[PDB]
Amino acid sequence: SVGIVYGDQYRQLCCSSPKFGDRYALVMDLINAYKLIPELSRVPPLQWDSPSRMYEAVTAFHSTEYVDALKKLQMLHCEEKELTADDELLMDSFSLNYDCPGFPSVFDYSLAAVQGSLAAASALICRHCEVVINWGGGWHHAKRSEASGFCYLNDIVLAIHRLVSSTRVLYVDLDLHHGDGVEEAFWYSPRVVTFSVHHASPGFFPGTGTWNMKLPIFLNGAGRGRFSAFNLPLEEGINDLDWSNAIGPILDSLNIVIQPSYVVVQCGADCLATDPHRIFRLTNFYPLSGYLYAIKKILSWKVPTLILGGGGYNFPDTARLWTRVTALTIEEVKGKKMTISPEIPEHSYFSRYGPDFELDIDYFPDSIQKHHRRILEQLRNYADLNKLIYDYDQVYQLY
Ligand SMILES: O=C(NO)c1ccc(Cl)c(NC(=O)c2cccc3ccsc23)c1
Ligand SMILES: [K+]
Ligand SMILES: [K+]
Ligand SMILES: [Zn+2]
């Protein structure tokens, strides 16, 4: 089946942050408004038998001191008094500040995404689901002891750790931003191949995933993980077709050579032409959306796959995209036509889809060849180092 992570408390917690507001509610309520819920298997978020068991799960990646600090941040933001200077310094030492502020539910909110994506991994492992979706997860910037980019706990790393320890995993990051936290976690691990496509330019967050600044070279992993971290930085303005042609052959070659046991896809929606970032020009169009082209290709591999959320700051349009991603997954996996009306159905958040109330977003539409050459050589090097065999010319022909 196709699983999807939701529940009543989970929804309250995913909607409890200042930055992402009620986005999760719009997403799940649009999927429900389109009558997709009866097609899907609800995956309940994971819950633990003790604080010690929760800490054991979370500190598989994060340091205990960082988890302790994130929990203290929540407790302090649940009292009226201001923080002491010592507590400000403590939070500064974990970057729990500026773009990663505290709020009264910051730990419960961050932990919830971990609970969802770990439960999603488990459903794939025990083969209850062939694909699982978690639109409350995808927080790819969080590091072992550092919050970053409004990501406080890295649910993706923790899910991938569960999958690999249950084996090779292919991680695909479609967000506008470089998936640096996941890349870094698995920098020395050849069994987790990471691939991020993103915008990169001077001063643009987080700054990695591109030529490294001697002449600038492309770092790609280290130790036994050399060649195992892949990146495709793109300049602004790219449309559906060109983004699709940019990553299509890379994805297909990665599946052919890696032969992964699991695929984890981060599907951050901030590449949409209508996102307030206004960098890329992707759509949710479905006759083609770069997102739907990528997800359809990945699902055609028939590999157990985790689909996560991530960025996306135009909430109605992020719901518009992820609702189509969800319908496509049902169609590809179950083999069962999904007929979505081009008009937003009436439901609690119908008014947020003004003024036209259509499912299509309100948008009217050499450097990549060099990257493909570089990426082909890296995949060959990765295959060489890891004693994987594959038709070189059949792979080279994909590009
Ligand atoms: O998604 C991220 N990583 O995958 C990510 C990480 C850090 C930041 Cl700073 C942003 N974006 C904004 O904070 C933002 C920028 C431009 C306009 C607007 C409107 C609402 S938020 C926003 C994104
Ligand atoms: K990305
Ligand atoms: K890696
Ligand atoms: Zn992003």
With H, G, I as helix, E, B as strand and everything else as coil, classify residue 14.
helix
CA of 313 relative to ligand 1 center, distance in Å: 7
Which uninterrupted H or E stretch holds 193? Answer: strand 192-199
**Dist. CA 182–CA 156, nearest whole Å:** 7
Gap from CA of 45 to ligand 1 centroid (Å) = 26
Q: Which residue's alpha carbon is at the smallest distance from atom 22 of ligand 1?
A: 313
Distance CA 231, CA 218 (A): 9
Q: How many CB atoms lie within 10 A of CB 227?
A: 20
Residue nearest to atom 7 of ligand 1 (CA): 149
Q: Report the separation in Å between the CA atom of 187 and the middle of ligand 4, taken as the mean of its atom positions.
A: 20
Ligand 1, pocket-test mutation among 17, 150, 176, 204, most atoms within 8 A of CB: 150
Q: Are 25 and 11 in contact (CB under 8 A)?
A: yes
| Alpha carbon of 246 to ligand 3 centroid (Å) | 21
Closest C-alpha residue for ligand 1 atom 5: 149
Task: Specify the 3-state DSSP secondary structure of 350.
Answer: helix
Give nearest CA residue, ligand 1 atom 20.
313
Q: Is the distance from the beta carbon of residue 175 to the nearest atom of ligand 1 less than 6 Å?
A: yes
Elucidation method: X-ray
In the numeric block, the tokens 């500026």 are attached to 98
Q: What are 224's two structure tokens?
A: 């036994």
Q: Which ligand is nearest to the CA of 149?
A: 1
Q: Which helix (H) or strand (E) holds 32?
A: helix 23-33
Ligand 4 centre distance from Cα of residue 159 (Å)? 19
Residue tagged 């983004």 (tokens)? 243
Domain housing 179:
1-399
Query: What sign does the CA torsion over 56, 60, 66, 71 have?
Result: negative
Rounded alpha-carbon distances, angstroms, from residue 167 to 148, 171, 191, 192, 262 = 29, 13, 7, 9, 8
Residue 264 Cα to ligand 2 midpoint, Å, equals 12
The reply to whether ligand 1 has any atom less than 6 angstroms from the CB of 311 is yes
Number of domains in the chain: 1
Q: What's the CATH number where 149 sits?
A: 3.40.800.20
The DSSP element (H or E) to which 134 belongs, if any, is strand 131-134
Decide if 2 contacts 131 (C-beta within 8 A).
yes
Asked whether 232 and 250 are in contact (CB, 8 A), the reply is yes
108 among annotated binding-site residues: no
Question: Is residue 310 within 6 Å of ligand 1 at its C-beta?
Answer: yes
CA quadruple 358, 361, 362, 363: dihedral sign:
negative
Q: Which residues contact 294 (CB under 8 A, 6 or more apart)?
A: 172, 174, 244, 247, 248, 251, 265
Q: Is 177 assigned a ligand-binding role in the annotation?
A: yes
Active site residue 141: yes
**393 among the known binding-site residues?**
no
Please list the helix, strand and coil fractions of the chain in percent, rounded to the nearest 5, in that order: 40, 15, 45
- Asked whether 61 and 185 are in contact (CB, 8 A), the reply is yes
Atom 21, ligand 1: residue with shortest CA distance: 313
Q: Is the CB–ligand 1 distance for residue 29 below 6 Å?
A: no
199 lines ligand 1 (CB under 6 A): no
Choosing from 77, 128, 140, 141, the catalytic residue is: 141
Ligand 1: residue whose CA is nearest its atom 15:
277
CA distance 62 to 76: 21
Sign of CA dihedral 175, 181, 184, 189: negative
- Ion ligand 2: residues, CB < 5 A: 173, 175, 196, 198
- Does 99 sit in the ligand 1 pocket, CB within 6 Å? yes
